[PDB]
Paper text:
CRISPR-Cas systems are prokaryotic adaptive immune systems and phages use anti-CRISPR proteins (Acrs) to counteract these systems. In the type I-F system, after pre-crRNA is transcribed, Cas6f processes the pre-crRNA into small crRNAs, binds it, and further assembles with one Cas8f, one Cas5f, and six Cas7f proteins to generate the crRNA-guided surveillance complex (Csy complex). AcrIF24 targets the Cas7f subunits by engaging up to five Cas7f subunits (Cas7.2f-7.6 f), sterically blocks access to the crRNA guide by the complementary target DNA, and induces non-sequence-specific DNA binding to the Csy complex. AcrIF24 forms a homodimer and further induces dimerization of the Csy complex.
To determine how the Csy-AcrIF24 complex recruits dsDNASP, we purified the Csy-AcrIF24-dsDNASP complex by incubating the purified co-expressed Csy-AcrIF24 complex with dsDNASP and solved its structure at a resolution of 3.02 Å. The overall structure of the Csy-AcrIF24-dsDNASP complex aligns well with that of Csy-AcrIF24 with an RMSD of 0.458 Å with 5313 aligned Cα atoms. The reconstruction of the Csy-AcrIF24-dsDNASP complex reveals three discontinuous stretches of density that are not accounted for Csy or AcrIF24: two helical densities each bound near the hook domain of Cas8f, and one vague stretch of density with a cylindrical shape bound above the AcrIF24CTD. The helical densities near the hook domain of each Cas8f allowed us to model two short segments of dsDNA containing the PAM (G-C/G-C) sequence. The dsDNA duplex is clearly separated at A1(TS)-T1(NTS) position, but no density is observed for the following sequence of the protospacer. For the cylindrical density above the AcrIF24CTD, however, it is difficult for us to determine the orientation of this segment of dsDNA. We speculate that the cylindrical density might be contributed by dsDNA molecules bound from opposite orientations. Taken together, dsDNASP is bound both at the hook domains of Cas8f subunits and above AcrIF24CTD in the Csy-AcrIF24 complex. In the structure of Csy-AcrIF24-dsDNASP, K247 and N250 of the Cas8f subunit are involved in dsDNASP binding, as revealed in the Csy-dsDNA structure. The density map showed that the cylindrical density corresponding to dsDNA segment is also near the HTH motif of AcrIF24, especially R196 and K197.
Residue numbers in the entry:
A (entry chain Q), E (entry chain R): 6 to 338
B (entry chain V): 2 to 76
C (entry chain L): 3 to 223, 239 to 322
D (entry chain X): 11 to 434
The structure:
DNA sequence: AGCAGCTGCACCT
DNA sequence: AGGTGCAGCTGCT
């Protein structure tokens, strides 16, 4: 028995693009007609602040570079001067049926994998994973830089059963930290709903709205696009922000990456905090791979030891493997 | 490995990226201190291809500078 | 060669997944031989049973939509393909490139037989429409009726009937239904004229049909040498590479009851024009004729100017 | 004689390729056994592969790689009907195509190398002493070697087609049908591909392209081909289909055979006051290019004044048909006829370009529009044409400008008749 | 007698390119002015997630590969943020005359084929194949990934005889599963209609419209294009969705492949579900060919045993070869 | 008493 | 996201 040649997993926990709108705090219950945060342009005169090559550290060349500065156009998004609260809204569907791949070659490999995940579900439910997902919804981690230095963050989560709301959760997202996973009754009820969605025993659709009290006219941070070339035929536009229908918006993969920031079992440390679940669980902001393949704690070696050779790892690493299965991806040769 | 075309200079960005799976680099075209353009060109581009990517902008610069600083005409 | 007694108008035919390549040199609109074969199969299917013959096609191409893409670092274009099913060993398939497209075209069909004699025009038009709503045109399916409820019925129009001024008025009111699209004709005379005035430099014929339909940029005596119309290459027809062959003597024929031959494409120049630029609406009918003593198997549209 | 010595050198080159694949276990034993057998009987080994070769113009393998059929080498007769371009016209430009296995293509490359230099390309068959003395074989072996090249030059195929080929029906005049099996012309596309890659890149083409930027003119011809389509032949291995498929890298270039407007863009007819007031002019991109091409021809002298006036009349007739087609596409494109905020005379001409009355449109205003035909809007179009055609005392004082205005008035009268035929 | 050297069956069940649109649930009756779902672009930045080679497990090399960003441009298609219902509409014409090939070199073989399929229709009608095709139109199998995890799917089929609607069918596509084949009076009436269309007794035209209740602003999944790479050139857009006149669409052959997923008679299993009918019946998702030629259950040997050797196979294998006749193909040596 | 197929291997740029 | 052939091969009789 060997691993399959092609083997692919569709994602559970599908979010949408989060849209931004603006309003005043304590009108946030009437925040259905709040106007969108629009993306504008402004001019930026760039100074000289890079490290020099020290073949270019001659003072005459430096002053000649300072005398002629370069200029860009830059997309920017601010709150209005009369509104102090950013509202960010998206929808998230929890699907279930996490072990089944969407593509496979070997029948014996997918049957061994299916009974492996069946034994995992029978040992413990999705309660740890859904507890951590509900925590990452409770604290507003999906506000990436908009949460930083906010005065008050409040998350409203609506389980939507038919076209109307079935249940409502209200969270103070600054009390629920970004560091540890506590216990709370409403948080455990949300975790039970997410675990019921992940187990295939229901169809879970939630609407997540987050209100951050930042200040009047302050800068908000939508998702940022990719610029390949830049010339004078444009405005020397050097920064593009993502937008859905003239609304500053966040990419769906950004919200998804902030949802699955649950991995506290990586071997290097635990005082740093959780990271996102990746094969060779890596942080682009730190340029580093936790769970290196030289240690036996990346996703691929753990999966191959669990399925092929029946070496079941510790329950923390089993949580990590099933989290990587819910995350989805292309796993094969 | 900068490229010099007269007064123009095309320099790469000292750390590439991966666009579409392939390794690329950002090349900046300067006219002295004034930055004229930026492109993102792949690796395994020879320097002739990097020259012929910016040749059009260089030619439009020559056209505008030739028309702008044209001498006077008496009749 | 034969002036039609009447014209039937296939009003607005939408076609999905039609063949785009249609030639080893062109890739755009499909060849006019497809439309001639369409009305010959239509005559075989519903034309014979009504004491009607059909002779030619006029085509106007209301809209085009090729399934192509431009590969992000080049000025040329590639075709979008389909995923064929796997081989018997389950490995993969062999990629053969085919070019699909979407078409909106109207057809002008000539009639010589007992048109208004045996049957009225409305029933003939309706059952020819019902027959053409079950076949496929150029390798791609005739897309059936959708929420276009208006453009359904046809107009069987008698050509030589009525006064000559009334003939011009009814053909103009039929041209009023052919406004958005641009009709297609053959331009062999313009090809030979430019071939003769080009032969003052060198005697070559395919280099003419190259130089006729590109953007020639001539130096300052920066200009662009231009033709007054929309001159395109077309597959002009077939010329035989072989003598005639009996129905049995060649293996793997489509039928053992029909003679076979090996052929090559003759290429010529066509032209897209506005339908108001032609005064007689029977000028646009593409006839295909065989000269079987040699290989000359032609589609054209004679009696056009 | 000496040609034979050259052939031996070619064999040595083949050995070098084998040498790169060096194995310290047993590679020397295979290498010595290969090199001695090659130096002994390279011609005898090559003839067995060269039997599989076929020298051909027209191939069935581009139609489908799975298909197998007879591929014929001929240059067809000159056609009687005028206005024709085909592979038959350029006979001296022709290049021979090879069909077979890739190991056979190695022997085909060896034979093509043997054709170069001396007259041995036509002298592989027509020579005995000069052929065998250079080949170093027996006279019977030399005759057997000449027979192999004579057979490889010949077709050697039974007449047949495949099920994956086309084999279409052509109808006869008042008779039955005929089957026509079309073959992919391979030499013809190779010649057209040579001409296209010469026009696209050379020192002539690149020099003319740099001269367009420099704007300094030397006598030259500069060609330019827009939106060719690339077709890849068979798989990633191009040598399987043909020999020239490997030289053209398995791709052939297709010229655009498209209709004029094949990229539909939605036009905003809708309700602005200045939007309708400026859309009364209605300058489009292709109309703007036609207007520049027409305006350049204006100052032309009387020596080409006849052809220049004919070109100006053709440009005016093209611009009138483009305006009629744009009005027709704008009328079909918009679903309703929307009221505009503060749109006077944009609504005034848009009533002439109007569709039928809608639910928002009044029955009284619709009846007023249906009662009067908008010929005066055609007069406004004449005002647009006077905007397009620059006139002055150089044309008004001369006789040619009055004739150009008369031709423009005749074109505007035809356009006004076509417009007034709809309304009223 | 022998097989004809050419054999060519024109396809029946011609579908259209299914166009997508969006709106709200319980407005689906007025869903004729529903706006089209459009294809946008966005930027993605990923990490290294695939399997590394055993030579490339070096941790310094893994960190040095991580510190170069991985950027793609991706075509995406979403629902609007105020619509929760995707509407997918296509037209399907049934032609009839399922026996006649478009090309046959042997005359006696085509006469034996014609009387063979004539006897097949005389033995029983198309009602098995017609009922299975009506099942595949009843459950929304043509919603390929759009059906997965949907809240409520609902199919409306309008048979249009003249310019107006002749008859209407209304189905809850989630009650009708994808595994088994039931019997329902409306479903059997549709089966009679499509059987009578297949028998040459008419030319049936159908308009199929499927409404899936996914969620507000969620992602839909149209077809993807095939773009072969410009390898020694710049990087390409790494996903391209199919669109017909700026409306996201599913390919016609995708709908056709979803329609003929009827084959529950392949020898390997019967609980894995129906597969699409093809000679050497092979699914691309599993990558493995059921109905191998070494067993005598593929299409070619079954056709040669029924026609040339006059060995009639079992009635489900006659159903299989009749479905391969309706499917069309180019057969021969 | 062979036959036909069949799988597998190798070529090659 | 190859066609080809042919050597060898299986075989059970």
């Amino acid at each position: 028995l060997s691993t399959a040649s092609v083997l692919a997993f569709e994602r559970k926990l599908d979010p949408s693009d989060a849209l931004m709108s603006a309003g005043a705090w304590a009108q946030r219950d009437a925040s259905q007609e709040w106007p969108a945060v629009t993306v504008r342009e402004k001019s930026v005169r760039g100074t000289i602040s890079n490290r020099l090559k020290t073949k270019d550290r001659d003072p005459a060349k430096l002053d000649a570079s300072i005398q002629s500065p370069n200029l860009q156009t830059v997309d920017v998004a601010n709150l209005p001067s009369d509104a102090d609260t950013l509202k960010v809204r998206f929808t998230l569907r929890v699907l279930g049926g996490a072990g089944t791949p969407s593509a496979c070659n070997d029948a014996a490999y997918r049957d061994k994998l299916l009974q492996t995940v069946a034994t995992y579900v029978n040992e413990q439910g999705f309660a740890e994973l859904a507890r951590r997902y509900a925590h990452n919804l409770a604290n507003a981690r999906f506000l990436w830089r908009n949460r930083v230095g906010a005065e008050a963050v409040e998350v409203r989560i609506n389980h939507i059963r038919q076209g109307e709301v079935a249940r409502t959760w209200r969270f103070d997202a600054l009390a629920i930290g970004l560091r540890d996973f506590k216990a709370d009754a409403e948080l455990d009820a949300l975790a039970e709903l997410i675990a019921s969605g992940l187990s295939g025993s229901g169809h879970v659709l939630l609407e997540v709205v987050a209100f951050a009290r930042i200040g009047d006219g302050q800068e908000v941070f939508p998702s940022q696009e990719l610029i390949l070339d830049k010339g004078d035929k444009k405005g020397q536009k050097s920064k593009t922000l993502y937008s859905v229908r003239d609304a500053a918006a966040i990419h769906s993969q950004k919200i998804g990456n902030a949802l699955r920031t649950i991995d506290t079992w990586y071997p290097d440390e635990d005082g740093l905090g959780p990271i996102a679940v990746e094969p060779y669980g890596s942080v682009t902001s730190q340029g580093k791979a936790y769970r290196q393949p030289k240690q036996k704690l990346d996703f691929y070696t753990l999966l191959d030891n669990w399925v092929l050779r029946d070496e079941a790892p510790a329950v923390e690493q089993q949580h990590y493997v099933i989290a990587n299965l819910i995350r989805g991806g292309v796993f094969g040769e | 490995n900068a490229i010099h075309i007269g007064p123009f200079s095309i320099t790469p960005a000292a750390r590439g990226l991966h666009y579409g799976g392939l390794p690329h680099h950002q090349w900046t075209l300067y006219y002295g201190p004034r930055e004229m353009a930026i492109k993102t060109l792949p690796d395994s581009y020879t320097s002739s291809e990097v020259r012929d990517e910016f040749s059009d902008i260089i030619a439009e610069f020559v056209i505008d500078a030739r028309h702008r600083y044209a001498p006077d005409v008496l009749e | 060669v034969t002036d039609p007694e009447a014209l039937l108008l296939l009003p607005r035919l939408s076609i999905q997944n039609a063949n785009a390549i249609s030639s080893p040199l062109t890739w755009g609109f499909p060849s006019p031989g497809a439309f001639t074969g369409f009305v010959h199969a239509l005559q075989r299917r519903v034309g014979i049973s009504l004491d009607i013959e059909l002779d030619g096609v006029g085509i106007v191409c209301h809209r085009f939509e090729a399934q192509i893409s431009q590969p992000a670092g080049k000025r040329t274009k590639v075709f979008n393909l389909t995923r064929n099913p796997l081989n018997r060993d389950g490995s993969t398939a062999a990629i053969v490139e085919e070019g699909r497209a979407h078409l909106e075209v109207s057809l002008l069909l000539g009639v010589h037989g007992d048109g208004l004699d045996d049957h009225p025009a409305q029933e003939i038009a309706r059952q020819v429409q019902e027959q053409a709503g079950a076949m496929r045109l150029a390798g791609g399916s005739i897309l059936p009726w959708c929420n276009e409820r208006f453009p359904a019925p046809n107009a069987e129009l008698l050509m030589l009937g009525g006064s000559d001024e009334q003939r011009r008025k009814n053909q103009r009111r039929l041209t009023r239904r052919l406004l958005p699209g641009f009709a297609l004709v053959s331009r062999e005379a313009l090809l030979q004229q430019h071939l003769e005035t080009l032969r003052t430099t060198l005697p070559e014929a395919t280099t003419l049909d190259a130089l006729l339909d590109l953007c020639r940029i001539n130096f300052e005596p920066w200009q662009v040498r231009d033709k007054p119309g929309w001159l395109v290459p077309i597959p002009a027809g077939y010329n035989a590479l072989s003598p005639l062959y009996l129905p049995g003597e060649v293996r793997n024929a489509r039928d053992r009851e029909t003679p076979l031959r090996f052929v090559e494409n003759l290429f010529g120049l066509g032209e897209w024009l506005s339908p108001h630029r032609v005064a007689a609406l029977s000028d646009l009918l593409w006839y295909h004729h065989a000269e079987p003593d040699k290989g000359l198997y032609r589609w054209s549209t004679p009696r056009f100017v | 004689q000496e040609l034979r010595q050259f052939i031996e050198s070619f064999i040595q080159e083949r050995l070098q390729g084998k040498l790169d694949k060096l194995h310290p276990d047993e590679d020397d034993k295979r290498q010595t056994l290969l090199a001695t057998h090659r130096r002994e009987a390279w011609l005898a080994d090559a003839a067995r592969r060269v039997g599989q070769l076929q020298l051909v113009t027209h191939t069935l393998k581009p139609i489908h790689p799975d298909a197998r059929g007879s591929n014929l080498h001929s240059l067809p007769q000159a056609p009687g009907q005028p206005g024709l371009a085909g592979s038959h016209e350029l006979g001296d430009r022709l290049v021979s195509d090879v069909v077979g296995n890739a190991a056979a293509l190695d022997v085909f490359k060896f034979l093509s190398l043997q054709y170069q230099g001396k007259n041995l390309l036509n002298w592989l068959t027509e020579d005995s002493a000069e052929a065998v003395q250079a080949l170093s074989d027996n006279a019977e072996q030399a005759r057997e070697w000449r027979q192999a090249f004579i057979g490889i030059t010949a077709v050697k195929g039974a007449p047949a087609s495949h099920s994956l080929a086309k084999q279409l029906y052509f109808p006869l005049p008042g008779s039955g049908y005929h089957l026509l099996a079309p073959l992919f012309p391979t030499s013809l596309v190779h010649h057209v591909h040579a001409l296209l890659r010469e026009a696209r890149f050379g020192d002539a083409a690149k020099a003319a392209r740099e001269a367009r930027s420099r704007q300094e003119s030397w006598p030259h011809g500069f060609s330019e081909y827009p939106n060719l389509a690339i077709q890849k032949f068979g798989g990633t291995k191009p040598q399987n289909i043909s020999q020239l498929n490997s030289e053209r890298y398995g791709e052939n270039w297709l010229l655009p055979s498209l209709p004029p407007h094949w990229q539909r863009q939605d036009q905003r007819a809708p309700i602005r006051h200045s939007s309708v007031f400026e859309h009364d002019f209605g300058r489009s991109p292709e109309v703007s290019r036609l207007t520049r091409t027409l305006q350049r021809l204006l100052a032309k002298t009387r020596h080409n004044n006849f052809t220049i006036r004919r070109y100006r009349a053709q440009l005016v007739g093209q611009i009138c048909d483009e305006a009629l087609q744009y009005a027709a596409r704008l009328r079909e494109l918009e679903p309703g006829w929307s009221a505009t905020p503060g749109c006077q005379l944009h609504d005034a001409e848009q009533l002439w370009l109007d569709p039928l009355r809608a639910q928002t449109d009044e029955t009284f205003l619709q009846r007023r529009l249906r009662g009067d035909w908008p010929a005066e809007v055609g007069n406004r179009f004449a005002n647009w044409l006077n905007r397009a055609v620059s006139s002055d005392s150089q044309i008004l004082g001369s006789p040619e400008a009055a004739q150009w205005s008369q031709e423009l008035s005749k074109e505007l009268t035809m356009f006004k008749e076509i417009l007034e035929d709809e309304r009223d």
